[PDB]
């Protein structure tokens, strides 16, 4: 790997510089190199890994949606034939997106998840696994679509089971997992009722636990709770 000769601490330092410079592809490559050193990641390091790939794949998803919409319009009645170029370029972007998702899943499987024993690490990585299978599901149209969807579901479910046992209802990781699993239900699994129920119950249980928190923890939890409320407002 191209980062094999760079110190772990230097890779982390440069990931933070890349973040400041909004160079998310570089940030992701540095964090991949850091993971491949083989040591477990601290809380801050897990967050850097997640931020980097979330931003890279987020940009790819936005581009894919623009191209997919143009392609859909091209296949409407009365639309002039323009050749294979729109499909080809949508496929190019799609293949790159799938590559990034496969890279992240590969890091999780080799060997982040198997070494993660604390709830905060294990839930966080399993949430990521669910997220990157969800992004694969967004673009899937073939024979493996059901298995891809099920892989997302299974990862989210394991994360949920641990989070409910081991974390308070206001824990930001538990909240963010629930937010994203609810979106999975709505957008991927054709289960809007499940999405709504999950968001509502998560919000309400968090509300009831806010009284236990410091000012700073309260701010952290309420920020994510607002996103649950925003989605509920969108969906009702």
């Amino acid at each position: 790997g191209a980062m094999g000769s760079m110190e772990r601490a230097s890779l982390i330092q440069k990931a933070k510089l890349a973040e400041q410079a909004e160079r998310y592809e570089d940030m992701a490559a540095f964090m991949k190199g850091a993971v491949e050193k083989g040591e477990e990641l601290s809380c801050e390091e897990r967050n850097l890994l997640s931020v980097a790939y979330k931003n890279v794949v987020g940009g790819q998803r936005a581009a894919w949606r623009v191209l997919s919409s143009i392609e859909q319009k091209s296949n409407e009645e009365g639309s002039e034939e323009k050749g294979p170029e729109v499909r080809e370029y949508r496929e190019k972007v799609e293949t790159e997106l799938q590559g990034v998702c496969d890279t992240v899943l590969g890091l999780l499987d080799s060997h982040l998840i198997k070494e993660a024993g604390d709830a905060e690490s294990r839930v966080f990585y399993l949430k990521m696994k669910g997220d990157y299978y969800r992004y694969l599901a967004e673009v899937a149209t073939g024979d493996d679509k059901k298995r891809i969807i099920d892989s997302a579901r299974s990862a989210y479910q394991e994360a949920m089971d641990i989070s409910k046992k081991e974390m308070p209802p206001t824990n930001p990781i538990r909240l963010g997992l629930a937010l994203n699993f609810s979106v999975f239900h709505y957008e991927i699994a054709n289960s809007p009722e499940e999405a709504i129920s999950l968001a509502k119950t998560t919000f309400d249980e968090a509300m009831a636990d806010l009284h236990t928190l410091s000012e700073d923890s309260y701010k952290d939890s309420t920020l994510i709770m607002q996103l649950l409320r925003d989605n509920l407002t969108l969906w009702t």
Binding site: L179, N180, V183, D230, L234
Partner: peptide, 5 residues
Amino acid sequence: FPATV
């Protein structure tokens, strides 16, 4: 699109 983190 809905919010995710």
